[PDB]
Amino acid sequence: SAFERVVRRVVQELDHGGEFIPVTSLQSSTGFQPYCLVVRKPSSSWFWKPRYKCVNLSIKDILEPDAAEPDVQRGRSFHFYDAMDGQIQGSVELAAPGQAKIAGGAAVSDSSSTSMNVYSLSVDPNTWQTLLHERHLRQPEHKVLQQLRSRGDNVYVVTEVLQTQKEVEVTRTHKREGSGRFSLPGATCEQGEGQGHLSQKKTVTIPSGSTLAFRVAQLVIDSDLDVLLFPDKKQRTFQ
Amino acid sequence: SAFERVVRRVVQELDHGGEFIPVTSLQSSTGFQPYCLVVRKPSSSWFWKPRYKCVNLSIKDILEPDAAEPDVQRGRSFHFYDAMDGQIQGSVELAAPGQAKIAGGAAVSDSSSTSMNVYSLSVDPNTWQTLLHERHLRQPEHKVLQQLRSRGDNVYVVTEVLQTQKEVEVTRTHKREGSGRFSLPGATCEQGEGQGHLSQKKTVTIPSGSTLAFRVAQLVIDSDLDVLLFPDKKQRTFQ
Amino acid sequence: SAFERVVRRVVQELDHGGEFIPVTSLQSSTGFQPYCLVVRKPSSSWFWKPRYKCVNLSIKDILEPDAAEPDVQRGRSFHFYDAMDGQIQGSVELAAPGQAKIAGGAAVSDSSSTSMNVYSLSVDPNTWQTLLHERHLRQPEHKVLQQLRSRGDNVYVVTEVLQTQKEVEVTRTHKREGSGRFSLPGATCEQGEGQGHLSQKKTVTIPSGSTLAFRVAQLVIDSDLDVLLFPDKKQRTFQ
Amino acid sequence: SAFERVVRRVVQELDHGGEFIPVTSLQSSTGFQPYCLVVRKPSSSWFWKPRYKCVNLSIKDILEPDAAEPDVQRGRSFHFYDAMDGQIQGSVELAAPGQAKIAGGAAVSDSSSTSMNVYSLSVDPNTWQTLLHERHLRQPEHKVLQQLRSRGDNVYVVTEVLQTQKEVEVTRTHKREGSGRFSLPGATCEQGEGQGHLSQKKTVTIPSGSTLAFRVAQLVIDSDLDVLLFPDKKQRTFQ
């Protein structure tokens, strides 16, 4: 996919530290911003993980007096680089288990590269409490929520983002080579050959300011809005 | 087809992230724009997917005061590049299973290329809310809908577009080489030959600003208009 | 036909996307313009498909006050190029099944080329709506319709055209080389020869502004005119 | 992980001197600042140690008169450097325990490097006691604590931090080489080969002002705030 590899590497460069739910969609990378809303259904049994659905909706219009007040203050610059290559092959000279004198082989080769820079933007809980206490919910707003209420899915907000700030790119390659030479005096053939190789590569480029991972903070809607920073499981937003 | 290849590759470079129903009609890529209606019939049983039919009609004229109000604000820059080539072949020297001394072979060769740059445009659901509450439906507008009402097919709006803005082009080639030398003392012939090889290539250039994929938002028409950004299945637009 | 090949290729470059009824008659390419009428008889049983017959007639005369109002606004630029090469042959040295010593052969060679640019001109459904609203039918106008009424064939309008304006040319060739050397001591002959080879070439150039395909929109004439952008089968225009 | 190695080495350069609970999350490194709050749940039985999770909250706002008074006065500069390289290989010529003549081998090679400068910032107990004296707790502040009260987890403060001032870098590599030559006349094969080698690299640059380790000082919330500079195990902050 040329994207899950690098984002998985970036998250693994933290030794599974912090939640930082990684992103998969090129279209949803841009939609994951601070104060954004996401919608997730309850899990099926234990392991059918309900994947996160990004909703391009902020909290400013949900509240009445048109907030439009981002409070991003965190910022740092981690530079990262790596590479990779390999070569796997094999050969067999088989004559006993049949009527053949098989002379075949194979070879697999590939590579990779990556280099980026990284911020980390957050939102302070004090900003959340100021926003909640000063300003309230526009309760006659369900044209985006009434159907969402019928679904009843818990709605979360984005409290953490990790984005890249440079002309970042990734380059991959691939080489798959097959071979075969069969000299089999039998019933259907006497001599035959089979081989085929294909090369392949690509190049993907990410623009500056693209979210790579995020963290959520569940909220509850029974009569009014309230954000639970570290809630428990089976915390139903609606009734 | 020289068009489904690259479009399928582009969708696959999302690792199946986001719906982004890909387009197949190269002429209909131009008709897929934000605020444009599409028509889809109900599915047949489970897998006979009703393919989306483009309609070159917007919602501005459906509403009375000649809206003509686009709210496009999204934009990022993904640059893509890749390549591919392959070559399979074979050879057979068959003499036992028949009356022939066959000397034949084959060879298939092909290649490809692609280079592209991509923006993406969106529509804010707050804009949907404002648009819905500011104006009502011009109910005496059905000479496009009474036939649609007779069909009763569910209609959608275009909320996402992923278009390419550059002289993007592809160059494909293809070889098919066959050969044969038959020395077959039998009943109808004694010696014969058969072979044929053909080359093939093409080149298609997509102009700047052509939609590649889209996401829809179902609406309901029973007495007045209302759009459901994410409704449930078997939600009939009409009665 | 030196024209069906390239138009079939152009339609195939859409992967059967959209109806886009292709044209076959070189003279009928100029007659397929927007707002033009076409006449099609009902199908025989299932597969005797009634081929569309172009009529060099517009709708501005059918309405009384001489509208002459085209609403062409669609336009893009698809550049397409391709080529083709092919060559097969054969050889048979036949001696057993008879009294002959036959040494013959054959060879077929051909090529093709095409380079063109593609536009597309369509019409908005709202234009159809207003065109029907303000302005009506001349009921004393049947010199072109009374015989059409007697035939009763369903009449369509041209709602979409794919026309090209560049100096496109097609350059084909063809070689067929037959050979044979017969040494057959029998009853009528003892030794003989027979062979014949002919080349071939052509070059057709289509001028600017030539329609390649089109789409229809059936209407109904029982008492007054009304256009159905997407009706059902067996919708008889007349009574 | 390219991050645990260096922090573990830095802590081991103290011979287990000082607590300095090491940091594992790169996102949490910037969040570990003096006067910051962390949350730890009780341990399970003895060894399921609850990993410390940072909370991006200071103590200036929990007390009413907007403290914003850091008392950092500690400072020193330790310069540290190291390196490493290795090479582990092997070879086996095995013929007795089977039907094979096995000639295989392996090779592992890797390296590392690091150069770093280190401060240490602290806070005086006298500051804690005086700050407790002048100003008290906002008792109507549990919208960030009442759910934390429901968790019941003991809350700490950050009293010691160790950070770096350079663009410190790490350069790990890795080589894994596999080989094999199998001459095994048996039941399924007569001769075979198998090998595969892959290199690897990475380079992470940690910017200036990144926390490496920290120490905590538990506080108690039963009716008012009070910090114990060194409490005992199973001291419940809440009731």
From Swiss-Prot, chains A, B, C, D:
Effect of E13K: No spontaneous pyroptosis-inducing activity
Protein name in UniProt: Gasdermin-D, N-terminal
Lipid attachment residues per UniProt (S-palmitoyl cysteine): C189
TM stretches of this protein: 89-95, 101-106, 178-184, 189-195
Lineage: superkingdom: Eukaryota
First and last residues shown, out of full length: 3 to 241 of 484
Signal peptide region: none
Site label Cleavage, positions: D85, G86, Q191, G192
Free-text domain note: Forms a ring-shaped pore complex containing 27-28 subunits that inserts into the membrane. The pore conduit is predominantly negatively charged, facilitating the release of mature interleukin-1 (IL1B and IL18). In contrast interleukin-1 precursors are not released, due to the presence of an acidic region that is proteolytically removed by CASP1 during maturation.
Positions of post-translational Phosphoserine modification: S183
Gene that this polypeptide is encoded by: GSDMD
Localization per record: Cell membrane; Secreted; Mitochondrion membrane; Cytoplasm, Cytosol
S-(2-succinyl)cysteine, modified sites: C54, C189
Residues bearing PTM Phosphotyrosine: Y35, Y156
Lineage of the organism: Eukaryota, Metazoa, Chordata, Craniata, Vertebrata
Impact noted for substituting R172E: Reduced ability to form a pore
Function: Promotes pyroptosis in response to microbial infection and danger signals. Produced by the cleavage of gasdermin-D by inflammatory caspases CASP1, CASP4 or CASP5 in response to canonical, as well as non-canonical (such as cytosolic LPS) inflammasome activators.
Oligomer and partners: Homooligomer; homooligomeric ring-shaped pore complex containing 27-28 subunits when inserted in the membrane. Homooligomerization is promoted by the mTORC1 complex in macrophages. In response to a canonical inflammasome stimulus, such as nigericin, recruited to NLRP3 inflammasone with similar kinetics to that of uncleaved CASP1 precursor. Although this recruitment is also observed in the absence of PYCARD, it is more efficient in its presence.
Membrane topology value: Multi-pass membrane protein
